[PDB]
């Protein structure tokens, strides 16, 4: 439920952002 | 991984959004 | 603040998910 | 666009996360 969602975001969002930026450059 | 973050975007984020909206009208 | 964030997510998240899936296949 | 969604991931999503956490402890 909410708590596991938050925890995935907190940990996993920074890598996602990096990735997406890379992909966009390419 | 991206894969884990990606599954939360598709299922836990939408429900979280609806949650936030409920709490804002309270 | 929160309301503009939500509104960007609601509208913009489905396209983001599609995109990311495509990129991952490639 | 992705570009618009991407800026919200980087600035409005983190603050929203902190918000949710405040509301959950209430």
UniProtKB/Swiss-Prot annotation, chains A, B, C, D:
Describe what happens upon changing residue 10 to A: In MelP5; increase in size of pores (10-12 monomers) that form at lower concentrations of the toxin
This chain is encoded by the gene named MELT
- What does the annotation give as the result of altering residue 21 to S? In melittin-2; possibly an artifact
Q: Which domain of life is it from?
A: Eukaryota
* Subcellular location(s) per record: Secreted; Target cell membrane
Can you name this protein? Melittin
Residues represented out of the complete protein: 44 to 69 of 70
* Subunit structure, interactors included: Monomer (in solution and for integration into membranes), homotetramer (in solution and potentially as a toroidal pore in membranes), and potenially homomultimer (as a toroidal pore in membranes).
Tissue pattern of expression reads:
Expressed by the venom gland.
Positions of post-translational N-formylglycine modification? 1
Name the job this protein performs.
Melittin: Main toxin of bee venom with strong antimicrobial activity and hemolytic activity. It has enhancing effects on bee venom phospholipase A2 activity. This amphipathic toxin binds to negatively charged membrane surface and forms pore by inserting into lipid bilayers inducing the leakage of ions and molecules and the enhancement of permeability that ultimately leads to cell lysis. It acts as a voltage-gated pore with higher selectivity for anions over cations. The ion conductance has been shown to be voltage-dependent. Melittin-S: 1.4-fold less hemolytic and adopts a less organized secondary structure than melittin.
> What is the additional note?
N-formyl-melittin major has 80% of the activity of melittin. Melittin: The secretion of this protein into venom follows a seasonal pattern. This variation is synchronized with phospholipase A2 variation, i.e. their production increase in the same months.
Question: Modified residue Glutamine amide is at which positions?
Answer: 26
Swiss-Prot/TrEMBL site (Important for the flexibility at the center of the helix, flexibility that is important for the stability of the voltage-gated pore) positions? 14
So what family is this one in?
Belongs to the melittin family.
């Amino acid at each position: 439920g909410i708590g596991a969602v938050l925890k995935v975001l907190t940990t996993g969002l920074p890598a996602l952002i990096s990735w997406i930026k890379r992909k966009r450059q390419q």
